[PDB]
Amino acid sequence: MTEYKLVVVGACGVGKSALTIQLIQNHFVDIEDSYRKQVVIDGETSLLDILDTAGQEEYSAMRDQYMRTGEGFLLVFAINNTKSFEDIHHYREQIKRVKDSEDVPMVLVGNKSDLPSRTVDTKQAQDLARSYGIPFIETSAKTRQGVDDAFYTLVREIRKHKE
């Protein structure tokens, strides 16, 4: 069966685990960092294998393995965390180095879109995604806004790369 190895990267606290729980287990509570589930996306059955990582957790060799084999990456920031948005370039540069490629499937995700506290403008994030040549999706793990779209868009980006 087709498998997609996905890695969700971003600063601590941006909602990577919440987003992944919402996708996989369909709920939110306001915790596992790996997940595996069979889904159907655009009529194609596949298994999603997902790691959530900020880059400084304990199991660094495991993380390096997942980084090297990851077929697509969600770059997650929170709309109420300017530092998390500033960290996105670092995470993208690290992915490109480990993958040794300038063409790695990625999607930019602005999470916590339900909150009224915003310090990152949607235009700023759109502009950054445009410069990187990747999709930008606004999400809320709390309301489910954009969640399926973020992960399924990343799967579609991987398919583009494979074909």
Contacts with a copy of itself by CB under 8 A lie at 36, 42-44, 52, 54-56, 65, 69, 113-114, 116, 122-123, 126-127, 129-130, 133, 135-136, 138, 140, 142-146, 149, 156, 160, 163
Q: How many residues bind ligand 21F (CB under 6 A)?
A: 17
**What DSSP string describes 72-96?**
EEEEEEETT-HHHHHTHHHHHHHHH
Q: Are 14 and 91 in contact (CB under 8 A)?
A: no
Complex with a copy of itself: residue 34 or 162, whichever CB lies closer:
162
CB of residue 3 vs ligand GDP: minimum separation in angstroms? Answer: 23
Q: Are 74 and 150 in contact (CB under 8 A)?
A: yes
Q: Are 4 and 71 in contact (CB under 8 A)?
A: yes
The SS3 assignment for 48 reads strand
Determine, following the binding rule CB under 6 A, whether residue 144 of this chain makes contact with ligand 21F: no
Determine, following the binding rule CB under 6 A, whether residue 46 of this chain makes contact with ligand GDP: no
Which residues, in sequence order, are CB contacts of 132 under 8 Å at separation 6+?
92, 106, 108
Q: Are 90 and 146 in contact (CB under 8 A)?
A: no
112 binds, among ligand 21F, ligand GDP, a copy of itself, none (CB under 5 to 8 A by kind): ligand GDP
Closest C-alpha among 37, 49, 47, 28 to residue 145 = 28
CB of residue 15 vs ligand GDP: minimum separation in angstroms? Answer: 3
Residues forming the site for ligand GDP (CB under 6 A) = 10, 12-18, 30, 52, 54, 111-112, 114-115, 140-142
Interface residues with ligand 21F (CB under 6 A) are 7, 9-12, 53-55, 57-58, 62-63, 66-67, 91, 94-95
